[PDB]
């Protein structure tokens, strides 16, 4: 609700403490772009002001409104306050038909007010003593219905064969068939047993997402006292206040925090309207989390591939240049806030592994929920078949081979000496 | 249908599910370490300091999360600063195992601008150890 | 991801403990409605099964999939688990183009596992000793930039003239210009002073939305110890875990819990895709809250008026019949869970008051953020002008007059004897 | 501000409970020494009275004012109250041009009110089981920029080769590149590993200096629960209230307390003005600390050598006679308060080791921050080369050899049978 | 303790997150001002670098060394860490005779990490 | 460039980084113990009670800071009160290792006026132990 004079300031020079926002903005037919753009800014020292409006090429009725916000509008250390100020009221506004917040700029004077991710990519990798390759994961296949004993038996055989992590389903919290505390012991019995056998560090993301903040801290105290490495949290359904609380507890006691993204496609799927995932991934980093589901890249065109490589750089890097081709609309200095490791849901089989090593490199977790479970020999040969294929593709990268072309000839060179991969090569 | 074996099947995290690296494959990895500005360095441990253990947690309260033992191994000499030739690293693998015939050896690398450890992979196993299976582990 | 045989069971009879869901479902061109509908259900004792698919009249490619869920899929007392199971993964599914969850059915075996709203409509009304009319409210007009002293001075003059509640802006949390604890004292000095003058109970919704669960409980301890009646919480930006934690604290210490709905139009605005507000309003009731912004009804057509009357009955009533004309797709027994008072944003002026009394009746709060502030005499005559107009329209209802027709002649009969309303009648 | 009659009492006899102070006092040109000296005392049962004024030989305008203070001016157990009474206001006084407090006398009725150092020299030496030689130390060479993993790897190789302690840099607290809690684990993994290998007790001074008293106690709880022996504290930048709090916690839980002296040369460097280190070292002992950086003696003339031997005796001994040649202006009975071990920053090489054993004897820690790191073979041969040179010089002392003369012939007798020292003999 | 090449960078442009310090700096007789000024900075991503040296008018042997510090050297919310990094070791350095830190610049990315004064002038009043 | 060895390189705190003390060098230290009023005394431990361990901390809460085991060794006889002759101490080293051939031996000293232990240094290693390297430990 602007009068277009005070909230549309194109002659304005943005500050280095300003929060900048980039809205994809569809007006009603007959509303001017400048009046609609100043209304997104309106929602004198505290006004948000639209400072630039660009047409979108190919879309006859879409625009990019750039809105600057003074840093005094915000609470130190609060993603709840940052989302409530920027997207709290504007999407119900009637003069626009659809609105998408595309990117934010978080200025380094406000990045520094947050605690952030408890460890980050570099510290987690030091603590798990796993270097030079991607981490590997597996969701336990039947999401619900197991006993707690039979859950850890599925957790034991997967970590045994070579994987680095196993994963609770995000709707595995505490149900009548498997309560949460019976699960945390059979998981910790299965982690400490698969660890002592392989000699490698093992983990399972124990779901500490809970009904209240007090249940949630009670699960997390339990993982502290078993000494297990990592818990997970649904943060768009638990919320940012519960997430930031858990992420500070995880820093204060050395637990790692996997972050799952349940309910993300309610918010980020549609192109004309919502909040795109790169905003929700910047906000997770500011709130904190050590891992974050970034999605699949296999089975997709190379227009969503460049966008997916854009929000993975916002998660991992320290300084991300402006790049409109990857969907990055601002420049993001992260001011030595630690990186978040992206978790990429790998395909059904092992032949997507040369695609994922070339796209992601080393700093990524890779998950095969039906890759380890669907092996004809079981969980421990299936977990070896991924681990053999992962390390074979990693070696062909360091030797210099192009995994976009020679990636089939590297898997087939490892079907020879390894029977476990060959049984998965046969499917 | 086979069974992956649980008995004497210890592994080291990178390149252990592969057959043991030849001297040409170790030289191919050091070429990757030198092609960017990384610094190769060797480490070693005996059979009792090689893989992970819990034994110092007898002194702890509840601070045991992501603490392990035997994640440090002893450095062999110093990091090869200004290393351009991969055969200079490969001479040190023979020189280390001559001094320590009962010791595992891993080649680690360090980044110069990020000041962190980058890649670390086992390049030698002892013959006197029965902790690992010779690549036919079913 | 269904094979359409196991997850599409049209011969199935639903249970009285089943969670039922109704999805508005747009397929990709070429995907059958039954295969797309069973895939929403698929996401044997734990499977969700699509049991009915209806075409949508007027939409050539939309359908209503009814999916039943067994009660064992869910945690007792957890809205986080209920949303993570139902909408946690399905919206990113590729065979449908858009998906909207329209309604849920919460069965009475799962309504009873929740604590719910701390007081409800009937207990709050007893405690504030306000009967037989709607409650009145006002947001303090400048959202940001006041001092804390000048905030309560705006709070003092509004509660003085006749209003029952004043309101923090939802992005007023704790900022460099007005910290939260300096605000809670000048509010409590302004509430206790406007109370002693009028002899009526007064309140201000002190925003306890915070960055962490520990900050949030620290604000709420502060309102407990000042003895002020009511706090507020942004629950779609603070999350359901923080909300349910606060709502249990509010029950355990007799505070009331106003609930604001920041970020609702990211989720509920678009018709083909998202989660409609009636699901988010059922879920607020299960989580808990004493008041909830239900929106405006004035300035809207009578197709959104019947929908707005539908989700207000889900908030207030105990037993809501199935009614497709009001958007109610199931029958909802609330099993003596207390009602939530809807908060309705009134118009700019006092002439929308005969509309709001006829639409809402007594069990509603009515807010005039620019109705009290925009009076030419100030805040205390402006607050009287609403309070005079509210009680005049209430009296004309009890005397039997039709406020849809004679509502202008009732305001004009009160412009005569009251100078404060006449100064607002003149604008 | 004195009238010179009441505050200059030369006929006064001091008490055994009096706090005595000795001020080096430069007047303005034209101010008498007695009037300037009584003004330092003035700042009847509570007055401080200047009782003696001596000229300084060689300085034409400097004087030594001796001021006595009644014991009732002071709080029991408080170095904050003791400094606030004595040096809290006098240095801004206008009739003097410069002022240096040189020594204090703490009377045994006020020494006994303090808790003091947690263990002392005799108990620490029993607990570490190291006898008959000086302790050895090393700062980890790059102060900032390591990871936490690479920090303990530098900590592991130094303690491995023979050293007794490694040391955090005093500005290593908690920074974005190495948080404090990630550091405390890789240190404790490196201490317990270098301990199990050598069979000797090892430690690292983990910097518990922090931003608030609550952060500071949170670091110290962490060192309690890892069971690591020793923490360190910057006490002139953390302050005496934080130091005395930590020193009581260290007594109550058996941790040792290394004390670093950051910011000391702001206060103690200039000769005409400030507070000399021997006052700040008496005050550290009363507050508490087990070790204290006393400085270098090598590379200095033998007029600062006699002064350095003076404040080391105030740290270690029980009863220190008056000795004007060593800068000791009073007699100090320490009344069985435990000693503080001085930490002496050794030179760049091993040839200063015969100097340090003769100057300090056994009760000293010796630090070689660039002596172990700068060895051409690494950290573990460099740590052996000091440990070999330390024990060789210690043995030549017990055999009776003069280390002021024959100390080069003792190092060269150990370059023969030890290759590690010979590689450092060659540099 | 600088080699004067790495810690005296007059061509350097300071950052908006840099902590800047201004030292009044008296050398020993015979020590150059640039070598003495880089030594205050020395005490590559973590180095403090002297970027400007000015004479003091009227004082024949005093100088103003301007030293920049990267924001990563510091703890969020800690005046103890800020003083320990800047004035913790430099005043005992032997090549200068006297040293005064005159001013600091606290950058707004590090002002925001502190809680600050509880009320301030406007709230107290 | 050499590597300090991690394998079988246990040390005792004082005079262990030196080659083993001769009987003239042990007599030179006892002359230093007798030149002031100190009281020499011998101790001994087996191979399992010689160096430091954590094993009693299984019984603890979080009271483990600066607790170790094997810091006490068993005293051999009694402290030599009024000891003027260093050969009387040196006869007891031969007499102790005859009784205990599998035992380390250290000579400790105690102060009389301060009533505390002053110096303590290993004077004998067993031959049957493979815990130490014979001074060529690289």
């Amino acid at each position: 609700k602007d009068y277009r004079l005070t909230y549309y300031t194109p002659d304005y020079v943005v500050r280095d403490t300003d929060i900048l926002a980039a809205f994809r903005m569809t007006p009603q037919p007959g509303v001017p772009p400048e009046e609609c753009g100043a209304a997104v800014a309106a929602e004198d020292r505290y006004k948000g002001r639209c400072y630039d409006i660009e047409p979108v090429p190919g879309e006859d009725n879409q625009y990019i409104a750039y809105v600057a916000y003074p840093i005094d509008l915000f609470e130190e250390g609060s993603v709840t306050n940052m989302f409530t100020s920027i997207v709290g009221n504007v999407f119900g506004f009637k003069a626009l038909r659809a609105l998408r917040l595309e990117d934010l700029r978080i200025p380094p004077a406000y990045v520094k007010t947050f605690v952030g991710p408890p460890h980050g990519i570099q510290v987690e990798r030091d603590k798990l003593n796993k270097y030079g390759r991607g981490l590997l994961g597996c969701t336990i296949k039947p999401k619900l219905g197991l006993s707690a004993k039979n859950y850890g038996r599925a957790v034991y055989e997967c970590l045994r064969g070579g994987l680095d992590f196993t994963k609770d389903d995000e709707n595995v919290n505490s149900q009548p068939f498997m309560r949460w505390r019976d699960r945390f012991l059979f998981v910790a019995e299965a982690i400490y047993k698969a660890q002592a056998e392989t000699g490698e560090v093992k983990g399972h993301y124990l779901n500490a997402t809970a009904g209240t903040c007090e249940e949630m801290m009670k699960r997390a105290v339990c993982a502290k006292e078993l000494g297990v490495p990592i818990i997970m949290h649904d943060y768009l359904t638990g919320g940012f206040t519960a997430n930031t609380s858990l992420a500070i507890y995880c820093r204060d006691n050395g637990l790692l925090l996997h972050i799952h993204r349940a309910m993300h496609a309610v918010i980020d799927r549609q192109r004309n309207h919502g909040i795109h995932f790169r905003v929700l991934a910047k906000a997770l980093r500011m709130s904190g989390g050590d891992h974050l589901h970034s999605g699949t890249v296999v089975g997709k065109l190379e227009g969503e591939r460049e966008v997916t490589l854009g929000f993975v750089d916002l998660m991992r890097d320290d300084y991300v240049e402006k790049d409109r081709s990857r969907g990055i609309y601002f420049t993001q200095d992260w001011c030595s806030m630690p990186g978040v490791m992206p978790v990429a849901s790998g395909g059904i089989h092992v032949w997507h592994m040369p695609a994922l090593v070339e796209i992601f490199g080393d700093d990524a977790c890779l998950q095969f929920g039906g890759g380890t479970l669907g092996h004809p020999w079981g969980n421990a040969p299936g977990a070896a078949a991924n681990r053999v294929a992962l390390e074979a593709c990693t070696q062909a990268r360091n030797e210099g081979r192009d995994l976009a072309r020679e990636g089939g000839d590297v898997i087939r060179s490892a079907c020879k000496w390894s029977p476990e991969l060959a049984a998965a090569c046969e499917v | 249908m086979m069974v992956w074996t649980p008995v004497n099947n210890k592994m080291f995290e990178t390149f252990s599910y592969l057959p043991p690296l030849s001297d040409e494959q170790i030289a191919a990895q050091v070429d990757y370490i030198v092609a960017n500005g990384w610094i190769p360095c060797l480490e070693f441990a005996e059979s009792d300091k090689a893989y992970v253990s819990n034994e110092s947690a007898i002194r702890f309260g509840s601070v045991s999360c992501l603490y392990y033992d035997n994640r440090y191994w002893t450095m062999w000499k110093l990091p090869m600063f200004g290393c351009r030739d991969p055969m200079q690293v490969l001479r040190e693998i023979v020189a280390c195992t001559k001094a320590f015939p009962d010791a595992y050896v891993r080649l680690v690398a360090f980044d110069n601008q990020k000041q962190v450890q980058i890649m670390g992979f086992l390049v030698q196993r002892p013959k006197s150890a029965r902790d690992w299976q010779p690549a036919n582990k079913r």
Side-chain angles (χ1 to χ4, degrees), chain A residues 4-372 374-427, chain B:
Chain A
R4 191 260 183 190
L5 295 174
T6 55
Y7 294 102
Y8 180 71
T9 63
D11 205 0
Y12 171 68
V13 183
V14 303
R15 295 183 183 94
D16 57 350
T17 53
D18 276 332
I19 279 84
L20 310 184
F23 288 93
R24 185 182 297 276
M25 184 186 74
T26 301
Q28 292 295 329
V31 178
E34 290 86 4
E35 291 182 352
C36 182
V40 183
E43 297 169 345
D44 186 77
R45 289 174 60 191
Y46 300 99
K47 62 181 181 181
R49 50 262 195 103
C50 185
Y51 58 92
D52 193 2
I53 290 173
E54 298 176 357
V56 172
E59 296 289 328
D60 287 329
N61 202 1
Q62 286 184 353
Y63 297 99
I64 300 295
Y66 293 102
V67 179
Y69 299 97
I71 196 168
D72 286 333
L73 305 191
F74 302 106
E75 182 165 354
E76 297 85 357
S78 181
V79 175
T80 309
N81 203 167
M82 184 186 67
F83 275 179
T84 305
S85 298
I86 296 164
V87 295
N89 291 319
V90 275
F91 293 36
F93 187 67
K94 293 180 183 179
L96 49 82
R97 193 176 71 191
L99 186 68
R100 209 186 187 187
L101 177 60
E102 288 294 336
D103 202 7
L104 281 174
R105 202 277 308 266
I106 314 297
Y110 181 63
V111 178
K112 290 290 285 185
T113 66
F114 296 44
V115 167
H119 303 284
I121 283 174
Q122 304 301 114
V123 168
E124 171 189 355
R125 181 172 294 278
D126 293 337
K127 276 185 171 183
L128 299 173
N129 206 183
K130 305 182 173 69
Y131 292 94
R133 63 168 171 87
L135 303 184
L136 283 178
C138 179
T139 312
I140 295 314
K141 242 325 83 201
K143 310 178 137 229
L144 316 171
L146 280 305
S147 63
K149 176 85 180 293
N150 285 327
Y151 199 77
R153 166 172 282 155
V155 171
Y156 168 65
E157 305 291 330
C158 288
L159 293 174
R160 193 176 78 84
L163 299 177
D164 298 325
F165 290 109
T166 43
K167 181 188 171 290
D168 276 326
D169 290 298
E170 73 274 11
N171 50 2
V172 168
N173 301 114
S174 177
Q175 278 89 12
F177 53 87
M178 178 171 68
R179 294 298 170 186
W180 71 269
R181 202 193 181 275
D182 289 326
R183 189 178 73 248
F184 282 20
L185 288 185
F186 289 120
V187 164
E189 190 189 5
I191 288 170
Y192 289 153
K193 183 184 172 66
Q195 174 170 6
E197 169 181 348
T198 60
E200 293 170 344
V201 179
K202 304 297 182 184
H204 180 269
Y205 316 134
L206 292 169
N207 207 173
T209 292
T212 55
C213 297
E214 294 87 16
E215 291 292 320
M216 186 196 75
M217 287 298 176
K218 196 194 293 184
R219 278 99 147 114
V221 163
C222 183
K224 178 191 167 63
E225 285 170 348
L226 295 166
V228 290
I230 186 158
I231 58 174
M232 58 170 284
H233 179 76
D234 283 320
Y235 80 122
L236 293 171
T237 58
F240 289 104
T241 300
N243 192 191
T244 310
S245 303
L246 186 66
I248 279 170
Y249 180 87
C250 290
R251 171 74 72 80
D252 290 334
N253 295 313
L255 290 164
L256 298 170
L257 183 57
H258 181 80
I259 293 292
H260 189 267
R261 57 162 194 181
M263 197 182 172
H264 71 99
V266 187
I267 303 165
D268 74 0
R269 180 171 181 175
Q270 295 298 120
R271 184 182 178 271
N272 58 359
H273 188 83
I275 302 172
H276 188 269
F277 183 72
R278 74 177 71 87
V279 180
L280 300 174
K282 288 191 180 184
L284 188 272
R285 192 178 183 173
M286 293 163 62
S287 176
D290 284 317
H291 297 164
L292 181 66
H293 287 272
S294 65
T296 71
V297 194
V298 293
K300 290 183 179 181
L301 294 175
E302 291 177 352
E304 293 88 5
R305 182 257 179 87
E306 292 294 326
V307 172
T308 307
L309 290 177
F311 65 83
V312 169
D313 286 338
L314 295 174
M315 290 170 62
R316 293 191 298 189
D317 289 334
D318 193 74
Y319 186 81
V320 177
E321 286 288 333
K322 180 180 176 180
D323 191 358
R324 300 295 301 273
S325 65
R326 295 190 291 125
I328 298 159
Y329 291 176
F330 301 107
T331 305
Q332 185 65 46
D333 189 5
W334 286 104
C335 201
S336 300
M337 181 177 273
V340 185
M341 188 178 287
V343 179
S345 174
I348 304 169
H349 46 87
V350 295
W351 294 90
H352 298 295
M353 198 84 73
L356 298 172
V357 173
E358 188 180 4
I359 288 166
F360 286 102
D362 295 336
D363 292 335
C365 179
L366 297 174
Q367 284 199 354
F368 298 96
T372 299
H375 195 281
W377 296 359
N379 287 327
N386 295 117
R387 180 66 177 275
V388 167
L390 179 77
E391 293 175 353
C393 292
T394 297
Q395 191 188 6
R397 180 186 66 196
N398 313 133
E399 292 173 351
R401 295 167 64 90
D402 193 1
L403 290 175
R405 291 179 180 175
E406 296 179 354
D409 292 330
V410 173
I411 296 298
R412 288 189 292 270
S413 296
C415 308
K416 292 180 180 180
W417 55 266
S418 66
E420 299 87 6
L421 183 58
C425 296
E426 194 271 333
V427 172
Chain B
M1 189 180 291
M2 292 182 184
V3 176
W4 185 259
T5 182
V7 181
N8 293 117
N9 205 173
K10 298 273 180 300
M11 305 273 198
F12 297 78
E13 306 263 11
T14 312
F15 306 149
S16 293
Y17 286 77
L18 298 176
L21 296 176
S22 63
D23 292 332
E24 293 178 353
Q25 286 179 351
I26 295 170
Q29 299 299 111
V30 178
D31 289 331
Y32 177 75
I33 292 170
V34 173
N36 49 11
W38 294 347
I39 301 165
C41 185
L42 288 173
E43 288 182 353
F44 58 90
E46 289 289 326
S47 65
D48 53 355
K49 308 299 181 183
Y51 57 90
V52 70
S53 67
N54 300 325
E55 64 184 1
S56 295
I58 192 165
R59 295 180 67 85
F60 290 170
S62 297
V63 294
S64 100
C65 294
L66 287 166
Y67 182 82
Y68 301 98
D69 286 327
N70 301 326
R71 290 179 292 181
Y72 292 108
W73 294 0
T74 306
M75 204 181 271
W76 174 261
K77 286 186 184 172
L78 284 173
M80 288 74 167
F81 295 104
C83 182
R84 181 63 64 192
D85 182 71
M87 187 65 206
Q88 293 180 356
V89 178
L90 189 63
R91 292 179 181 92
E92 293 294 328
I93 298 170
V94 175
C96 183
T97 61
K98 183 178 179 180
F100 297 99
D102 291 330
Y104 295 90
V105 177
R106 63 191 174 190
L107 180 61
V108 304
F110 299 106
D111 195 356
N112 194 359
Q113 64 183 358
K114 191 180 288 184
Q115 290 179 356
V116 72
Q117 179 176 355
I118 296 298
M119 63 185 291
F121 62 97
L122 184 72
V123 298
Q124 182 68 42
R125 287 176 177 174
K127 293 183 182 292
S128 66
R130 296 291 185 269
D131 290 329
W132 56 271
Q133 298 295 322
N136 291 318
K137 62 181 77 72
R138 186 175 62 248

